[PDB]
Design a protein around this motif. Structure first.
Motif, mmCIF file in Angstrom:
data_model
loop_
_atom_site.group_PDB
_atom_site.id
_atom_site.type_symbol
_atom_site.label_atom_id
_atom_site.label_comp_id
_atom_site.label_asym_id
_atom_site.label_seq_id
_atom_site.Cartn_x
_atom_site.Cartn_y
_atom_site.Cartn_z
ATOM 1 N N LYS A 1 0.789 -1.250 0.000
ATOM 2 C CA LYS A 1 0.000 0.000 0.000
ATOM 3 C C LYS A 1 0.824 1.306 0.000
ATOM 4 O O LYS A 1 0.293 2.376 -0.228
ATOM 5 C CB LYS A 1 -0.980 -0.014 1.173
ATOM 6 C CG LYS A 1 -1.925 -1.230 1.211
ATOM 7 C CD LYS A 1 -2.978 -1.163 0.122
ATOM 8 C CE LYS A 1 -3.448 -2.565 -0.362
ATOM 9 N NZ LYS A 1 -4.961 -2.734 -0.284
ATOM 10 N N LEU A 2 2.137 1.230 0.218
ATOM 11 C CA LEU A 2 2.965 2.408 0.190
ATOM 12 C C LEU A 2 3.015 2.986 -1.190
ATOM 13 O O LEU A 2 2.899 2.247 -2.177
ATOM 14 C CB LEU A 2 4.398 2.034 0.640
ATOM 15 C CG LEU A 2 4.504 1.615 2.095
ATOM 16 C CD1 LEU A 2 5.953 1.039 2.354
ATOM 17 C CD2 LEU A 2 4.196 2.783 3.031
ATOM 18 N N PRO A 3 3.299 4.270 -1.309
ATOM 19 C CA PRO A 3 3.596 4.856 -2.600
ATOM 20 C C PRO A 3 4.699 4.096 -3.351
ATOM 21 O O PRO A 3 5.614 3.534 -2.711
ATOM 22 C CB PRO A 3 4.122 6.257 -2.259
ATOM 23 C CG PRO A 3 3.652 6.528 -0.984
ATOM 24 C CD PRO A 3 3.424 5.254 -0.237
ATOM 25 N N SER A 4 4.623 4.110 -4.678
ATOM 26 C CA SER A 4 5.590 3.399 -5.515
ATOM 27 C C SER A 4 7.020 3.767 -5.159
ATOM 28 O O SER A 4 7.906 2.884 -5.133
ATOM 29 C CB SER A 4 5.350 3.614 -7.007
ATOM 30 O OG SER A 4 5.489 4.984 -7.317
ATOM 31 N N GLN A 5 7.253 5.035 -4.853
ATOM 32 C CA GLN A 5 8.620 5.497 -4.632
ATOM 33 C C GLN A 5 9.162 4.894 -3.309
ATOM 34 O O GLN A 5 10.345 4.673 -3.187
ATOM 35 C CB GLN A 5 8.697 7.017 -4.595
ATOM 36 C CG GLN A 5 8.363 7.723 -5.903
ATOM 37 C CD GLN A 5 6.916 8.164 -5.990
ATOM 38 O OE1 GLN A 5 6.057 7.799 -5.138
ATOM 39 N NE2 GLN A 5 6.615 8.913 -7.050
ATOM 40 N N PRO B 1 8.792 13.477 -6.372
ATOM 41 C CA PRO B 1 8.821 14.267 -7.633
ATOM 42 C C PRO B 1 8.363 15.666 -7.305
ATOM 43 O O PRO B 1 9.168 16.552 -7.488
ATOM 44 C CB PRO B 1 7.832 13.561 -8.557
ATOM 45 C CG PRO B 1 7.406 12.324 -7.878
ATOM 46 C CD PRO B 1 7.729 12.455 -6.382
ATOM 47 N N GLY B 2 7.164 15.802 -6.714
ATOM 48 C CA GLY B 2 6.554 17.033 -6.168
ATOM 49 C C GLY B 2 7.444 18.186 -5.746
ATOM 50 O O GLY B 2 7.058 19.388 -5.909
ATOM 51 N N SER B 3 8.614 17.820 -5.189
ATOM 52 C CA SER B 3 9.638 18.754 -4.726
ATOM 53 C C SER B 3 10.729 18.980 -5.781
ATOM 54 O O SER B 3 10.732 18.379 -6.870
ATOM 55 C CB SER B 3 10.302 18.229 -3.422
ATOM 56 O OG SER B 3 9.349 17.966 -2.382
ATOM 57 N N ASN B 4 11.630 19.901 -5.445
ATOM 58 C CA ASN B 4 12.956 19.994 -6.086
ATOM 59 C C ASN B 4 14.067 19.577 -5.103
ATOM 60 O O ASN B 4 15.097 19.014 -5.528
ATOM 61 C CB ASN B 4 13.241 21.402 -6.664
ATOM 62 C CG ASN B 4 12.383 22.489 -6.037
ATOM 63 O OD1 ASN B 4 12.620 22.905 -4.900
ATOM 64 N ND2 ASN B 4 11.375 22.952 -6.779
ATOM 65 N N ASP B 5 13.862 19.836 -3.804
ATOM 66 C CA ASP B 5 14.784 19.364 -2.756
ATOM 67 C C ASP B 5 14.652 17.828 -2.520
ATOM 68 O O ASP B 5 14.000 17.142 -3.303
ATOM 69 C CB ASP B 5 14.616 20.222 -1.463
ATOM 70 C CG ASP B 5 13.457 19.774 -0.565
ATOM 71 O OD1 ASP B 5 13.758 19.356 0.576
ATOM 72 O OD2 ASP B 5 12.229 19.835 -0.863
ATOM 73 N N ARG B 6 15.314 17.295 -1.491
ATOM 74 C CA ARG B 6 15.119 15.900 -1.091
ATOM 75 C C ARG B 6 13.704 15.595 -0.603
ATOM 76 O O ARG B 6 13.224 14.453 -0.718
ATOM 77 C CB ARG B 6 16.054 15.522 0.046
ATOM 78 C CG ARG B 6 16.968 14.446 -0.312
ATOM 79 C CD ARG B 6 18.188 14.399 0.481
ATOM 80 N NE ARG B 6 18.065 13.380 1.506
ATOM 81 C CZ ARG B 6 18.176 13.592 2.807
ATOM 82 N NH1 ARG B 6 18.440 14.795 3.288
ATOM 83 N NH2 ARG B 6 18.059 12.571 3.620
ATOM 84 N N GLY B 7 13.046 16.587 -0.001
ATOM 85 C CA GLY B 7 11.670 16.421 0.430
ATOM 86 C C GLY B 7 11.676 15.826 1.832
ATOM 87 O O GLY B 7 12.684 15.824 2.491
ATOM 88 N N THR B 8 10.543 15.303 2.292
ATOM 89 C CA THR B 8 10.396 14.910 3.678
ATOM 90 C C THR B 8 10.151 13.413 3.885
ATOM 91 O O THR B 8 9.962 12.984 5.004
ATOM 92 C CB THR B 8 9.206 15.650 4.320
ATOM 93 O OG1 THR B 8 7.997 15.308 3.637
ATOM 94 C CG2 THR B 8 9.393 17.139 4.159
#
Length: 94
Positions: A9-13, A59-66
């Motif tokens: 169920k987790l996101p693909s990434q 993808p949503g980000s440009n940084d590493r994200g959270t």
């Protein structure tokens, strides 16, 4: 306590990150595999170096994200979407 989430169920990434951990990389970020000290005691308290963190690409980000996976010393896996504020246990059987 901590909620349970099925690996499927987790996101693909996130699933991609679990696969890379299982392969021992190579990882996309220099901070992949750094120790997570669990300083807020959100995960079970263990000794030093027990936990390590890995980036889940956003993808949503440009940084590493959270978005992160944290692993334990006997292969425990945890999901955090929000830079360690919330954790769920990942059920690999699932």
């Amino acid at each position: 306590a901590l909620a349970d989430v099925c690996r499927t169920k987790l996101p693909s990434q996130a699933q991609d990150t679990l696969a890379l951990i299982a392969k021992n990389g190579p990882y996309p970020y220099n901070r992949d595999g750094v120790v997570f000290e669990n300083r807020e005691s959100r995960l079970p308290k263990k000794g030093n170096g027990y936990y390590h963190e890995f980036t889940v690409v956003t993808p949503g980000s440009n940084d590493r994200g959270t978005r992160r996976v944290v692993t334990g010393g006997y292969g425990e896996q945890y999901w955090s979407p929000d830079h360690y504020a919330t954790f769920q246990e990942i059920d690999p059987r699932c």
